[PDB]
Amino acid sequence: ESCPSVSIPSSDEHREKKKRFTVYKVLVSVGRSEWFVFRRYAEFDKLYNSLKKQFPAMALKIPAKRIFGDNFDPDFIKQRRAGLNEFIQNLVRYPELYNHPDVRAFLQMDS
């Protein structure tokens, strides 16, 4: 029984097809191994919806999805990062959740 510890210390800006998007640099730690996994907001949202369909009764919060304005505003990104970090830290509080195959793949815990 080894519970993962996670955090999101920073975010970076990536590009695909000349189009900008933000990735959150997620630090994962299990036992004495640690690694980073990059995940953008749409992926956290995808994980959340999936988990919410399976367990429609948890009170897990995910930051807002529809933003009116500059979604690259630094203050906005920093607040979004804090919200995403709270979300994942609550996920790992429950073995029922951190052992779920989608959470493990999201965090690359079985690589």
UniProtKB/Swiss-Prot annotation:
GO terms for molecular function: ATP binding; molecular adaptor activity; phosphatidylinositol binding; protein serine kinase activity; protein serine/threonine kinase activity. The keyword Cell division does not apply. Residues 2-111 form the PX domain. GO terms for cellular component: cytoplasmic vesicle; early endosome; recycling endosome. It is found in: Cytoplasmic vesicle; Early endosome; Recycling endosome. Belongs to the protein kinase superfamily. AGC Ser/Thr protein kinase family. This is Serine/threonine-protein kinase Sgk3. The chain holds residues 11 to 121 of 496 of the full protein.
